[PDB]
Amino acid sequence: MLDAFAKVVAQADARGEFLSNKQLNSLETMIGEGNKRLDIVNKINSNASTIVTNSARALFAEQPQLIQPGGNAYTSRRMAACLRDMEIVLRYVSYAMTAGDSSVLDDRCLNGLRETYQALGTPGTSVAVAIQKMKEASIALANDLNGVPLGDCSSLNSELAVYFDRAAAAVV
Amino acid sequence: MLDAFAKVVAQADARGEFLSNKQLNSLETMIGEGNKRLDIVNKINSNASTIVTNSARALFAEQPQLIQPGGNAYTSRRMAACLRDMEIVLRYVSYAMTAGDSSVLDDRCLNGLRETYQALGTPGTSVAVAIQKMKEASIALANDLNGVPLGDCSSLNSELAVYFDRAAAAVV
Amino acid sequence: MQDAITAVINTADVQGKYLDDNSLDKLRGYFETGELRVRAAATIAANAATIIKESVAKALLYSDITRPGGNMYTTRRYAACIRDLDYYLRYATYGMLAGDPSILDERVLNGLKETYNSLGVPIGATVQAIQAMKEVTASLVGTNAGQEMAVYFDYICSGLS
Amino acid sequence: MQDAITAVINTADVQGKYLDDNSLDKLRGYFETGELRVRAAATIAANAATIIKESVAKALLYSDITRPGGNMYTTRRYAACIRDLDYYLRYATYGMLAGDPSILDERVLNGLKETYNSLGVPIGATVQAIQAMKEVTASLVGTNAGQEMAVYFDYICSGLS
Amino acid sequence: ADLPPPGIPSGQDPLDNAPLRHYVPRPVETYEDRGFATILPRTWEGETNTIGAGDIEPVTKEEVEESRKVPVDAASTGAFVEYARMMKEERAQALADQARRNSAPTSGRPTCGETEGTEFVSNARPILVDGVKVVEYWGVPNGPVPRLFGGPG
Amino acid sequence: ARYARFQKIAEPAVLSPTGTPMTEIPGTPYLGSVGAMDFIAQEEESVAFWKSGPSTTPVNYKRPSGAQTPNLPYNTAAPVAAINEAQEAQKGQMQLS
Amino acid sequence: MKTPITEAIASADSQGRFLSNAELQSITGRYQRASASLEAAKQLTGNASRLITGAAQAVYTKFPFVTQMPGPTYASNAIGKAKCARDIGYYLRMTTYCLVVGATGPMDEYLVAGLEEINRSFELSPSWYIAALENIKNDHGLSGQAANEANTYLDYAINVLS
Amino acid sequence: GYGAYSYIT
Amino acid sequence: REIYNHREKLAFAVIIGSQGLEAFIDLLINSEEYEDNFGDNMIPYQRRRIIAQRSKGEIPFNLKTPRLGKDFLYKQGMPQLLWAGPVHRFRPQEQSPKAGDPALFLSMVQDLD
Amino acid sequence: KDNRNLSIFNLKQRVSQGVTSRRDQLKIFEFCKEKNQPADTYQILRAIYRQVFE
Amino acid sequence: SIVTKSIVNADAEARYLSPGELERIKSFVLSGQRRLRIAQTLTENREMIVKKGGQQLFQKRTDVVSPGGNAYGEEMTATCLRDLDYYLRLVTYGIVAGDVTPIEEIGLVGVKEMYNSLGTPISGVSEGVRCMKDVACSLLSGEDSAEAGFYFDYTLGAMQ
Amino acid sequence: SIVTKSIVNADAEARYLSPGELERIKSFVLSGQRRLRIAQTLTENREMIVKKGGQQLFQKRTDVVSPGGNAYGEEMTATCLRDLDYYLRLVTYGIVAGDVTPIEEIGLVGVKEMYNSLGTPISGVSEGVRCMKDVACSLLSGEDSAEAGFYFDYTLGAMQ
């Protein structure tokens, strides 16, 4: 497992050179970004249960299929299970938002997930709609001007969106 | 695992309706049949070892192949495994005779059995001949007029025959 | 009719040319997308009845057609209506799986507007029914295959209108 | 009639939407090809005479048509034929420079097949004459613009045939 | 041959001297399903299949907005000015013509609604009716009737 | 197929929401669960609603079957159909009134 | 599914033996209590809709804020009332399934397994359902052993929720 | 037919 | 640990086919392997999931293998893609106006000062 | 390649030309006693309905 | 469009396009990038133009939203803002067309007959479009709002 | 109508109406006022037949009434009785027509495909029409409810 620094070091040892000053300037830049990073992860970790719950409400409202008898998400077992799975993917997107690399999110969650959701009969695209809703809620939550000094979060919101888009891309 | 009742309820929940009065009349009919069912299962559970042993004797007498050196039932190991597999199939046909549904017999025994007996080199049609012999012994045992008051039981013998025919059909 | 392959052989044939790199790029395109079209046609084959039921429930439900004097008012006209949605779904699947809407030109859209303007079938309600099949079908087969089915349902909708 | 711009506003209008990025891509396409269309129209305006002479000299002269009993036998009919060629070239230029063959639907191909089948004008020889104007015109305006004029001339030939 | 199939010990073969009557051909088994046959990211070469953090490019709030809008250049603007200069004279003429047409009443029987619905539809085109002329060639010239080769040779 | 489902006549195997045919055992396509509902007679099958009383008791035994005994191959696994014909030949019925 | 027959089979299957006299006596007892259970299922199926509507009225009279509280989870929308009778209808249907099966299997596998996470994550309250099941327990109007059966399984759902 | 679709009705 | 080959699945399925589930789990737990690596009080983990510096490693066992597998997936009564046809939405056309309608602009009318 | 002027309208017409392609695409229902399948036979009956009553 | 207009006049003169005309089409097709920006801005700011223009309309003209008027009610006011949305949209079509032909054939030919058939005072319509002209000239540059504002002026001249 | 069932017959035989057929037409047009009495009684007693037949339907068949049933819900239950009202009206048309052509072409041609496309069990429809047959036979005479009840029997034979 690799964060951004472990990725830089890992590549620089895979070629076996030192770090150039250019690389070190890039690292120092990411550090100066790092307090904003932790602020976004704090906002997500706070309101996470409302993200998962509201996104599931919008999922079942826009797709009324799964709540009906004979549906994939139907039974208390199956609802809790699908509901928990949304919490899983939100958890690892929080992790990869901290690490700056999408490695832990790939290696723990996304890698091999397709073969499971095929092997259960779960419609992948409904999962993808769910992840798009958590992306909408999460970004619209991350662009809140409450509690925090004004700053530019455009690049970090773009990065976070890259992580959710990778999740929806890996289920579909 | 599903018996008759669990299959009816499971389909009725897969559509999510209640049971009609038609269904309830059918269930009440099968209950009135159920004493005869327990009588058949008692006859099978009693004389089961003679079923397995005599059917193996007729197997090896009609096909003298497998008792010979090089044959599949040639070793003490392999013969014991042969006899015990016949005991397995007779055990699950007794189970599905009690349940009234062929689900337990499929899910525990027949589902994937062919891939195994292909994967070991075992002649499947010799297994099918064995199960036909247990069908002969078991039905001719079930139609004994000993110890039981007389009545009409052709439907239940037909059903039991459907279970054995499903076993021989699933190995071959 | 023709599929995408036959259409390539038609243009290359009718110019007298051989198959050049462009036409081979088109055949590469179709052969890349083929398996996706197959599984989409499999799933539509599986759930046709529920596509027509959900699309009639979306599109013709809570409407005056049901009320006396509307065009769906009798059992004969209701059955003819859902029969025509069966035709639209099925030929839309053929058009998807061929990769060429020439089927829709030959066997569906020919004379259909003259037929519905003859009988008194409302074209607007028909087009809304087809779009309801487009939304339900795209929900079943997903994003890519929903785009493919979307071009053929939109082809039928452009044909009637 | 309509040009490519009007057609974009037709589709965007008839959906009720405003202009999205697809329609702006279509307007960018037209505005990229604009100057090419302009100079092509300039050159055809310059050499109409020579296009007609060369194409009549290739396609029609020294045959049964200008021999007595053919349709171009009298002077009146010679002049009417060259006249017709002038109209095909002029409206083909309008169709090129609009980027949309609707003009040829409105003002040329309407009733033209009924006209020529009424009078006894050979359609075959007319189509051969138009294709002669297509080759000569493409030779004057070059490759790109010759493909564009090619479309309009082939549109009129598909209309007559 | 070589080795033994993925499941059988080299020393003992289950099909040792099997009769041709009862001989089941063994199915082909590969290790493709098993987890050790999957190919991991190289990573001793300089290739790691993760795209996080490094790929994203810093973006200011304004750049996104300017990148949303259509790009403009001086050539383009200057020729817009070139367009408004030539069209200046005819736009004014179009406005004056419209005010003159709508100002003067024709005043006949109105069709639908009240007091309006006269003989000319308001803002209709004179150029659609007047433009398309009916022109007997070899007749008295209704119109200009250019002739390509008319000019005497 | 829906007619059969809504009216509880039978369950009919239909292709799965994926498309691959609904099998109970993965060897052969289109199997169904067989037990205890196949054997209950439905009133919609019978033309005759009026007769409701069977007047005998059936008793089973084994008959020697003579000719009609199917030829079987020696020393090999016989085909499934042949053994079924051998058991269909040897079924006797007594009727006690 | 947990039916008495499948408990018998499942126990003998975990032991690897046959179905000796113990399990057969089990299936006998099931076959006797079955009849009164079927009659109870017939009459619950008979008056379902008035039991569900009556149960929802009892919940609304006990907790009058729920129709007044503006929210998604509360029954103030017409959608909310539809989800209300929807859920009480689920409980009534699972009770009828357990009456037919003869054990608590369908309730334990369709309803009881994981109910808590759902009533939490959508802030649903057990108390509202409990009041619903109390009104079902009062107004089912069965008599005798059939009433003992439906009171048994309805009470069982009540004791699951608390 | 006994049920006929007139635009008038 | 992943199963060595198909034959392991075969053998161990016989012993859970006759002795029952009990004696099977008795076999795995009282085995020498389990004693050698967990002893008496340790939760079973994933052995050697990540080799070293490689980023991927292997699919987690819980994630890799799930209940209701592909062969059992196709059995009767599985979750369907569309059946119930709920009419809960009533006059849905009311929720989504077409391009021509005011309704949207009515919301703008409520906005106006 | 000379024919540098052939275009979409010209090519649609040259493709669409002769007797319509339906000739090559008629399927004919033979009832053969050799390859007799009950399922197949039923499809022939249903084809008789579709031919006679359109 | 300018292409259509050039074609119609020349076609009616039965001659090729004139040298002056083809220069006009060159200037048009090169002024294309800028026009697109103008309609891009009025496209993405439509809600403020229609709402703010509707506010200045009803504040200047309290006739039609009074009880008794044409636009009395929530539904009728919404229909009124619907029409201002139509003309705002049309103005954008006229800007990319480079001519008033799109505005004239969709929106203006026979407008007085329609609003006289609806009982609507068309002077109120013209006041609404003039209000949207003031808002849309507040959203643009100098020469830019000169041009777009003159398309609005043509629609005002068609209503009056 | 009974009259039609003859003109089509000898039309396809391309002959004038047969003498035997003609006698039936006379017997039909003389039996008219009795038929109009029957359809008058079933007309003015429709509310009792639909309500009481719906009660016997739902009491015999508690499948539909229960949640998850095709007819569950206030809107759904009302429609169910709306369809019973349709068949009852049709039965009256078939009585005054002297033939089930009105019943067949308005109600029965393609009925199985519609209710199978709605998910409705058609056996419950036939049980409902049988319930209305019992009520309508309770409201009439002996021979009278024999006749009308046999029209109901035709509809039952078409549903099953």
Ligand SMILES: *[C@@H](C)[C@H]1/C(=C/C2=NC(=C\c3[nH]c(C[C@H]4NC(=O)C(C=C)=C4C)c(C)c3CCC(=O)O)/C(CCC(=O)O)=C2C)NC(=O)[C@@H]1C
């Ligand atoms: C986009 C994410 C936000 C934005 C964030 C900013 N936060 C800034 C400064 C800052 N934030 C924190 C909180 C953070 N650091 C931690 O250690 C923890 C938790 C352990 C969290 C949640 C701190 C401590 C600071 C700096 C000290 C202070 O402000 O008192 C910040 C200022 C720029 C910068 O420091 O880089 C920004 C822009 N602000 C925005 O407007 C969007 C909404």
Ligand SMILES: C=CC1=C(C)[C@@H](Cc2[nH]c(/C=C3N=C(/C=C4\NC(=O)[C@H](C)[C@H]4CC)C(C)=C\3CCC(=O)O)c(CCC(=O)O)c2C)NC1=O
């Ligand atoms: C470490 C990461 C990690 C995950 C991401 C999950 C992924 C996951 N989900 C399920 C299992 C499941 N997941 C869902 C979820 C769904 N319900 C629906 O309606 C939707 C389509 C979807 C939510 C968006 C359901 C319903 C099941 C149970 C499926 C079933 O048993 O039919 C399973 C099988 C084991 C189980 O039953 O729990 C697994 C591995 N598990 C993990 O360990």
Ligand SMILES: C=CC1=C(C)[C@@H](Cc2[nH]c(/C=C3N=C(/C=C4\NC(=O)[C@H](C)[C@H]4CC)C(C)=C\3CCC(=O)O)c(CCC(=O)O)c2C)NC1=O
């Ligand atoms: C715990 C062990 C156990 C059993 C072994 C059975 C034994 C059993 N069988 C019947 C009763 C019966 N048993 C049979 C059986 C048949 N009659 C025939 O003529 C055929 C030869 C044979 C086919 C199987 C019949 C026909 C009846 C009477 C009909 C009936 O009760 O359904 C009864 C009813 C009571 C009585 O008769 O006194 C009982 C208890 N039940 C049990 O609880």
Ligand SMILES: C=CC1=C(C)[C@@H](Cc2[nH]c(/C=C3N=C(/C=C4\NC(=O)[C@H](C)[C@H]4CC)C(C)=C\3CCC(=O)O)c(CCC(=O)O)c2C)NC1=O
């Ligand atoms: C009842 C009749 C009957 C037969 C006719 C044989 C036929 C037969 N031969 C082999 C098997 C074999 N047969 C041969 C023989 C050959 N070696 C060569 O160099 C020659 C090509 C060929 C002799 C002419 C060999 C070598 C094998 C083993 C093949 C192997 O394992 O690679 C097998 C597979 C089982 C086994 O390994 O023994 C069978 C069924 N068996 C029977 O039961």
Ligand SMILES: C=CC1=C(C)[C@@H](Cc2[nH]c(/C=C3N=C(/C=C4\NC(=O)[C@H](C)[C@H]4CC)C(C)=C\3CCC(=O)O)c(CCC(=O)O)c2C)NC1=O
């Ligand atoms: C292929 C070989 C073959 C056989 C060997 C016979 C054997 C046989 N016999 C009978 C049946 C019979 N067999 C006899 C014969 C007897 N009468 C007596 O006094 C003596 C004890 C005995 C002669 C020595 C009688 C009387 C019946 C009729 C019995 C009855 O109906 O009561 C039946 C029952 C069917 C029937 O009624 O015919 C059969 C299978 N059938 C065969 O298919």
Ligand SMILES: C=CC1=C(C)[C@@H](Cc2[nH]c(/C=C3N=C(/C=C4\NC(=O)[C@H](C)[C@H]4CC)C(C)=C\3CCC(=O)O)c(CCC(=O)O)c2C)NC1=O
């Ligand atoms: C298999 C069994 C089974 C159940 C028992 C239900 C239980 C259940 N109810 C809801 C969900 C809900 N349940 C209700 C019901 C209520 N409205 C009120 O006014 C009352 C307090 C209460 C009725 C008595 C409401 C209103 C919601 C939606 C809550 C919300 O979104 O705010 C959800 C979340 C998913 C959804 O939105 O549908 C679940 C799992 N679902 C099942 O699958």
Ligand SMILES: C=CC1=C(C)[C@@H](Cc2[nH]c(/C=C3N=C(/C=C4\NC(=O)[C@H](C)[C@H]4CC)C(C)=C\3CCC(=O)O)c(CCC(=O)O)c2C)NC1=O
């Ligand atoms: C739950 C269901 C279930 C089954 C149905 C069996 C199926 C089965 N049989 C064997 C294994 C075996 N099965 C047989 C049986 C045969 N001997 C012959 O002469 C005949 C061809 C055939 C009996 C008709 C033999 C001999 C073996 C051992 C094969 C060998 O080791 O060579 C194995 C491998 C494990 C083992 O060695 O026990 C398995 C999975 N096991 C199960 O768990």
Ligand SMILES: CCC1=C(C)/C(=C/C2=NC(=C\c3[nH]c(/C=C4\NC(=O)[C@H](C)[C@H]4CC)c(C)c3CCC(=O)O)/C(CCC(=O)O)=C2C)NC1=O
């Ligand atoms: C004049 C001839 C004629 C008939 C009969 C007719 C019936 C008809 N029944 C309908 C629905 C329906 N009909 C029923 C009927 C029933 N549900 C049950 O369980 C019972 C068995 C039964 C009532 C006795 C139900 C539930 C629906 C709606 C089902 C749904 O929408 O999900 C619809 C759907 C749309 C609409 O009603 O407007 C039509 C058109 N139409 C006709 O033109």
Ligand SMILES: CCC1=C(C)/C(=C/C2=NC(=C\c3[nH]c(/C=C4\NC(=O)[C@H](C)[C@H]4CC)c(C)c3CCC(=O)O)/C(CCC(=O)O)=C2C)NC1=O
């Ligand atoms: C694939 C090739 C193909 C198509 C598509 C097709 C359509 C078609 N639709 C028809 C009638 C009809 N079509 C409808 C359709 C509708 N009613 C509604 O209210 C709905 C809005 C709408 C359907 C969405 C109805 C009611 C009739 C029957 C009119 C009548 O004869 O009474 C008929 C007359 C024949 C008949 O059905 O009796 C044809 C031929 N025919 C074809 O060969």
Ligand SMILES: CCC1=C(C)/C(=C/C2=NC(=C\c3[nH]c(/C=C4\NC(=O)[C@H](C)[C@H]4CC)c(C)c3CCC(=O)O)/C(CCC(=O)O)=C2C)NC1=O
């Ligand atoms: C019945 C009325 C009628 C006339 C008159 C007529 C003339 C006619 N003259 C032609 C050519 C021609 N005509 C001439 C005539 C002349 N060259 C000179 O220098 C002299 C002044 C003059 C002879 C006195 C020449 C040279 C050509 C051929 C020119 C060329 O092909 O390059 C052609 C071209 C093809 C062809 O002849 O088959 C026609 C159709 N066609 C008609 O239907």
Ligand SMILES: CCC1=C(C)/C(=C/C2=NC(=C\c3[nH]c(/C=C4\NC(=O)[C@H](C)[C@H]4CC)c(C)c3CCC(=O)O)/C(CCC(=O)O)=C2C)NC1=O
């Ligand atoms: C006497 C009564 C009678 C006539 C005259 C007749 C003509 C006739 N010509 C036909 C086709 C055709 N006709 C031609 C003819 C020509 N191709 C050329 O290039 C030449 C210039 C030209 C002939 C001089 C061709 C190529 C086709 C085939 C089109 C196709 O189906 O592929 C066909 C369609 C059937 C078929 O041949 O496949 C008919 C029916 N049919 C009749 O019953």
